[PDB]
Homo-oligomer: A and B are copies of this chain.
Amino acid sequence: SGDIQDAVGVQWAINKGGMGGTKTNFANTGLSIGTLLQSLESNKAPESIPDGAIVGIGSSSFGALVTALSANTKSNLLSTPSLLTLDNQKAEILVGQNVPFQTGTTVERKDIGVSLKVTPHINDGAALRLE
């Protein structure tokens, strides 16, 4: 398995005069300019809620926030159960936990983990059948 994100955004906070402020709020990647001007009041009392690799170039009102992240996860699983059996004999291997689950509260036990159930049928020679 594998996946790769790539999140990157430039935000502009030119509050040059007037009621308003020509801020380019992009509520896409984590932080935003609206919560940044509320984060001014966070820097007053609480100083709360960061997200992402942030870079803030500002003259403290004339702002520009660049937010970026790049997750990159890989994974590689392998499993090899193996058992001996006769024909027409339901073998089984079960490895790993046994958990409850609600059917209401009227819970019930149920097995979780690697598992295998073979049933062969064996000719006198080649070409076995497996279920």
Contacts and interface: CB of A to CB of B under 8 A. Distances in A.
Given A19-B61, A100-B101, A107-B104, A25 B38 contact: no
Contacts of A53: 24-26
Q: Copy number of this protein in the oligomer?
A: 4
Given A20-B58, A20-B65, A22-B54, A107 B103 contact: yes
Interface residues of A, number: 45
A113 to B, nearest CB: 13
A5 interface: no
A63 B25 contact: no
Contacts of A47: 37-38, 41
Interface in A50-92: 50-61, 63, 65
Interface of A: 18-26, 32-34, 36-38, 40-41, 43, 47-61, 63, 65, 100-109
Given A37-B47, A100-B101, 16 more contacts: A18-B56, A18-B63, A19-B43, A21-B54, A21-B56, A22-B54, A22-B55, A25-B52, A33-B50, A34-B49, A34-B50, A41-B47, A102-B107, A103-B107, A104-B106, A105-B105
